[PDB]
């Protein structure tokens, strides 16, 4: 709604690939690559986010009621991620962009 959760996009923090998906998203050709997936640590999820000349991601603490990041509490990773789509600003970054290859597109 105002934030994301439904109209947003990176609320997929349940069963996908691990470092692989983020490395893929962080190393993709275009900027914007966003993706949340499981990490090897318990209560430790992560968020892949590729920004123009800037890239950084780490572990998020998930609880069966309210997930929390390394600074604030959030209703499921999708909440803070939805906030990012709503307030991204990074030119082609808005939690709703694929990773187009310079060579292909």
């Amino acid at each position: 709604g105002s934030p994301g959760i439904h109209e947003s996009k990176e609320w997929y923090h349940a069963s996908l690939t691990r470092a692989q998906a983020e490395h893929m998203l962080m190393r993709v050709p275009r900027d914007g690559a966003f993706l949340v997936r499981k990490r090897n640590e318990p209560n430790s999820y992560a968020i892949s986010f590729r920004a123009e000349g800037k890239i950084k991601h780490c572990r998020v603490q998930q609880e069966g009621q309210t997930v929390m990041l390394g600074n604030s509490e959030f209703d499921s990773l999708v909440d803070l991620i939805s906030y990012y789509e709503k307030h991204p600003l990074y030119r082609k970054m808005k939690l709703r962009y694929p990773i187009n290859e310079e060579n292909s597109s």
């Binding site: 691990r18 470092a19 490395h23 990490r39 090897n40 640590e41 992560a46 968020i47 986010f49 950084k56 991601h57 780490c58 572990r59 998020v60 990041l69 390394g70 600074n71 604030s72 803070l80 991620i81 906030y83 990012y84 307030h87 991204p88």
Partner: peptide
Amino acid sequence: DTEVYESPYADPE
């Protein structure tokens, strides 16, 4: 490396 961080994305920006 491939499986070990701590503070991910907390603020808009």
